[PDB]
Amino acid sequence: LDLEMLAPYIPMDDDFQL
Amino acid sequence: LPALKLALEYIVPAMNKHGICVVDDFLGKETGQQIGDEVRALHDTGKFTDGQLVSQKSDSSKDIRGDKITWIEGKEPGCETIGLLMSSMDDLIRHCNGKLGSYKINGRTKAMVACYPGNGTGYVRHVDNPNGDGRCVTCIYYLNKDWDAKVSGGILRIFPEGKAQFADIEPKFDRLLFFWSDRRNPHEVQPAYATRYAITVWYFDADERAAAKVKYLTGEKG
Ligand SMILES: O=C(O)CCC(=O)C(=O)O
Ligand SMILES: [Mn+2]
């Protein structure tokens, strides 16, 4: 079971600062 | 209730004790309906795309997750109420301070608006952040009225680490859900036989996220 290939994608850029 | 009272008096304890917290009737039927309509307009633009994976190794992403999604900042024309949702979530988190584990939450992703078309598709058992990409808390708002899992499926089943029994969360309308993103909470979206909508945001831990951004570019070698 390779969890990396199952994890949902998020962008590497464009975070939102709190 | 007041963001402060919900956070300190409910979210924080539930999260530190079980790693899962459910807040039903988060925003009320009126606001929830408005959000649902914004999501259905967005879907009706045809701009949704197949949900993707961190590092796809399978024939197609469809073998893993069968949803259609888009990303919203909350400031786009026609998404004002989704913006209100995201700002409410942020409010609760800010009011959680550093009382949610030992994380220092300073950022989050954009909102992932997601739709399981209802053709028996779902999301196999997975971990949102297995290998440390910064995601410390998952926050999901559901929008599906009078959803009966015995008829439509679509249960979110979580298997908290160590516990002998899983938990089945119905994707009910106006329901809010928090849970640890890491390997504590492997979860799955069981096959949905009806159109199933949900909005997700992932909150980041400052140090973990910062390291995650360098590990992608290189990761060195060993
Ligand atoms: O929609 C849900 O209940 C969960 C979605 C999920 O696990 C994901 O997209 O990573
Ligand atoms: Mn997930």
Numbering used by the authors:
A (entry chain C): 557 to 574
B (entry chain A): 188 to 409
Quote the study on this structure.
The ferrous iron and 2-oxoglutarate (2OG)-dependent HIF prolyl hydroxylases (PHDs/EGLNs) catalyse trans-4-prolyl hydroxylations on HIFα subunits, thus promoting their binding to the von Hippel–Lindau protein (VHL), a targeting component of a ubiquitin E3 ligase, and signalling for HIFα degradation under normoxic conditions. The PHD-catalysed hydroxylations of HIF-1α/HIF-2α in higher animals occur in amino- and carboxy-terminal oxygen-dependent degradation domains (NODD and CODD). The three human PHDs exhibit different NODD/CODD selectivities, with PHD3 being substantially more selective for CODD than PHD1/2 (refs 16). Biophysical analyses employing crystallography and NMR reveal that the molecular basis of PHD isoform and variant selectivity involves enzyme–substrate interactions involving β2/β3 loop residues (that bind the LXXLAP motif) and helices α3 and α4, regions which display sequence variations between the PHD isoforms.
We obtained a PHD2.2OG.CODD structure using the strategy used for the PHD2.NOG.CODD complex, but did not obtain PHD2.NODD crystals using this procedure, possibly because NODD binds PHD2 less tightly, as indicated by a lower dissociation rate constant (kd) for CODD compared with NODD29. Notably, β2/β3 loop residues (Val241, Ser242, Lys244 and Ile251) interact with the ‘XX' residues of the LXXLAP motif, which differ in NODD and CODD (Glu560/Met561CODD; Thr398/Leu399NODD). In addition, CODD, but not NODD, interacts with α4 including via salt-bridging (Asp571CODD–Arg396PHD2). In the PHD2.CODD structure, Arg396PHD2 (α4) is positioned to salt bridge with Asp571CODD; analysis of the ODD structures leads to the prediction that the R396T and R396A substitutions disrupt their interaction with Asp571CODD, but will not directly have an impact on NODD binding. Consistent with the crystallographic results, large chemical shift perturbations manifested at the PHD2.CODD binding interface including in the β2/β3 loop region and α4; 15N relaxation and heteronuclear NOE measurements reveal the dynamic nature of these regions, particularly the β2/β3 loop. Comparison of the ODD complex structures and those without substrate reveals clear differences in NODD/CODD binding, especially in β2/β3 loop and C-terminal regions.
